[PDB]
Symmetry: C2
Subunit: 278 residues, 2 copies
Amino acid sequence: PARLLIPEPRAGRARHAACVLLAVCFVVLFLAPIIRSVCTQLAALQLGVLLKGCCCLAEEIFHLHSRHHLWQVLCSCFPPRWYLALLLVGGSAYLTLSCLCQLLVLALGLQKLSAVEVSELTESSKKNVAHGLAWSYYIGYLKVVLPRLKECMEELSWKLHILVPLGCDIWDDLEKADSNIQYLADLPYKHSLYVIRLRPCVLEFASPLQTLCAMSQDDCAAFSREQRLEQARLFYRSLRDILGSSKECAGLYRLIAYEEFLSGLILWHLQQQQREEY
Amino acid sequence: PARLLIPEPRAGRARHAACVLLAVCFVVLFLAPIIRSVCTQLAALQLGVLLKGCCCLAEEIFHLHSRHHLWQVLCSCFPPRWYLALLLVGGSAYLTLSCLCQLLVLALGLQKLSAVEVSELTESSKKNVAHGLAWSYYIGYLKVVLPRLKECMEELSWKLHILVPLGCDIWDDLEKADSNIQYLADLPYKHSLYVIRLRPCVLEFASPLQTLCAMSQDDCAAFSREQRLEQARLFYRSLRDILGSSKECAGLYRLIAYEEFLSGLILWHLQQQQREEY
């Protein structure tokens, strides 16, 4: 037949190989004050973690109220091995040239990550659902529906509106959630023309958030609600970045993102589109 | 209304902040042989890249014929700044304790990546389409179709077969690509009972590979065919890992993966399932 050739997960034998190499070099060099030199060199390498944490703090200043709400900044900047660095610094002291060396290392950009590390981080994390969901929602639905919609609009004689809720409940129907929404008609693939008490609109939810609604409440695999929020924000970011560079879909859509009535937001978007027409 | 609070891409100001800190410490310490000490310390830090490359080679031994086909191993193990390390080693020499120190660093596992670096690698790469595609194909299609299929099979009086082609062409119809396939009937969401010259089967393609067929030939955004192959392999891996832990779908399916007649593979899978029934 044809035998399948798929890659497998990493067994993790580089760590044991480094351990064996360490034991061999340790026995060869073994065959009393040198451990002081070893520990001082070790603190000299570990001080770069502290300088990297300072630089990470300097970048993560701007996103306190938007991404970290103060403890979440300091918890996320340096790695959680916090008790190692200052302890080894105190063991070495009781130099500044080493700090200058670490700055020269980190500023130039010679710590390129290798291909195996990048591939390991790709195959490791399963929490990258947003990019695949955005590309599936763009290709499978939007690129076919969107060019025909202006033709359907001329046959009925605006642009499509996509709801992006960053919450959880999607099954709230638009006539059921919002009171002022009244259904009008279809366009021959559901397309529900609505009127809000008093403007007409073409409104639809974004489907794959229900996917994110199903990865949480079913709980056959592990997932959390803060992860749902982060993935929904990343999905909106990816769909915005794709459709901003959309070739044929330049003026057929307008994304509407919100969190938690509801119809006044739609009125503000319609008023902003009307003013943008002027 | 409600102002949106979405994160933005990183401006990249930590590098300039490290540069300013370097210039300040450089001016303060400035106010002739010390640069030899600096360069020797720099080679002492850069030797860990060489040891890390040796460990990466030791792990990437096992995947030559399966992932790298010999130059692709050595190109992928160490970072592409190869001319830096040996040159600085030669500039420092013309010690082994530093090698022992680097081994003690890399074996214990104190180089934890921070949260900001992990988030930067998540938001950076757009080539993680496989996990989102697999979860969309599992939730949106399989979890609803698969429990009703045995009821439809009893109403017609086996299990569903999913084709996973790792090639490119999906539009080859099963009566058109394979000659021995004959259509029989449906099951009231297309479900085409087939007979291969001479066994019956329930066969269907996997849909979202056409998504990967559309991200390549349209070419509105950049994508390559080797990336199509790697993403298809990752998609098959993710779908296999999900459906192996599928709760209700434990005996309703069998994935079939291949590359490039075609019907003999289906005969071998049916014969293996028949022998597994015995």
